[PDB]
Amino acid sequence: GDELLNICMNAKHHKRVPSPEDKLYEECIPWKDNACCTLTTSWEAHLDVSPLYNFSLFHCGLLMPGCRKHFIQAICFYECSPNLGPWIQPGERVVNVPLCQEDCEEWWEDCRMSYTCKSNWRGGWDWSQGKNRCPKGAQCLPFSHYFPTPADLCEKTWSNSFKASPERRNSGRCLQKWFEPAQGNPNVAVARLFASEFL
Numbered sequence: 001g002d003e004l005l006n007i008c009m010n011a012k013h014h015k016r017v018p019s020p021e022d023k024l025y026e027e028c029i030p031w032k033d034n035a036c037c038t039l040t041t042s043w044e045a046h047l048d049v050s051p052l053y054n055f056s057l058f059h060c061g062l063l064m065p066g067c068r069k070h071f072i073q074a075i076c077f078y079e080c081s082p083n084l085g086p087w088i089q090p091g092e093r094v095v096n097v098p099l100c101q102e103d104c105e106e107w108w109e110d111c112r113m114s115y116t117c118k119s120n121w122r123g124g125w126d127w128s129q130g131k132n133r134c135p136k137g138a139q140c141l142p143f144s145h146y147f148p149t150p151a152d153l154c155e156k157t158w159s160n161s162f163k164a165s166p167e168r169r170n171s172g173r174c175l176q177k178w179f180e181p182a183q184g185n186p187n188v189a190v191a192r193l194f195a196s197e198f199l
């Protein structure tokens with residue numbers, strides 16, 4: 001129960017334990033009250049091809065600013081959230097964090113006219129240059145082609161780290177990948193809920 005709250009997964013960048021950060025960079029600002037990411041990690045999240053993963057989102061050339069913003073926010077969420085304990089599964093990762101409907105929907109809307117070449121990003125890239133390239137015969141086409149629904153986008157872009165939830169925002173039953181810093185973190189209560197109910 002309490003074991004699952006206010007912890008950081010054991011992945012390669014995460015802080016051992018969450019704690020306030022005097023400064024986080026831009027999109028990661030929302031987590032600065034209590035974060036699993038360092039300043040350096042928050043900065044690296046914003047680089048053209050983040051050195052955190054060396055996965056290029058620009059593999060089809062056309063990735064729009066509004067689309068990339070959602071992806072940077074996703075990195076901040078993964079790297080900074082102290083509220084993922086309940087979905088930590090075995091050295092750890094996260095599986096099927098329930099993202100609210102609006103988080104998936106807007107992400108999808110803002111990425112429609114960007115281009116990718118694959119639906120299942122978890123693997124099957126041409127990796128020869130040190131960054132991933134589209135494999136042989138994988139056509140660059142709009143995100144709406146490879147991710148027909150918001151749910152496809154959320155789930156497949158991050159190797160099943162996230163699960164698109166039928167629940168909406170402020171329902172207490174799903175997590176937001178980003179939130180306005182003024183408002184305070186809506187995900188604390190949600191993690192508490194899953195923790196208390198033995199999942």
Ligand SMILES: *[C@@H]1O[C@H](CO)[C@@H](O[C@@H]2O[C@H](CO)[C@@H](O[C@@H]3O[C@H](CO)[C@@H](O)[C@H](O[C@H]4O[C@H](CO)[C@@H](O)[C@H](O)[C@@H]4O)[C@@H]3O)[C@H](O)[C@H]2NC(C)=O)[C@H](O)[C@H]1NC(C)=O
Pocket residue numbers: 051052053054
């Ligand atoms: C994503 O890709 C980037 C780019 O390759 C990668 O960052 C690079 O990591 C390598 C190794 O981690 C860095 O190389 C080191 O550079 C320092 C100088 O800053 C050297 O002192 C190091 O020398 C020691 O280590 C070598 C083996 O790595 C030994 O052969 C050598 O004898 C020394 O003992 C070493 O060369 C490189 O500087 C960075 N490059 C950049 C631009 O930062 C990043 O790590 C990748 N991300 C992930 C998650 O792997």
Ligand SMILES: [Cl-]
Pocket residue numbers: 081082083185187188
């Ligand atoms: Cl959070």
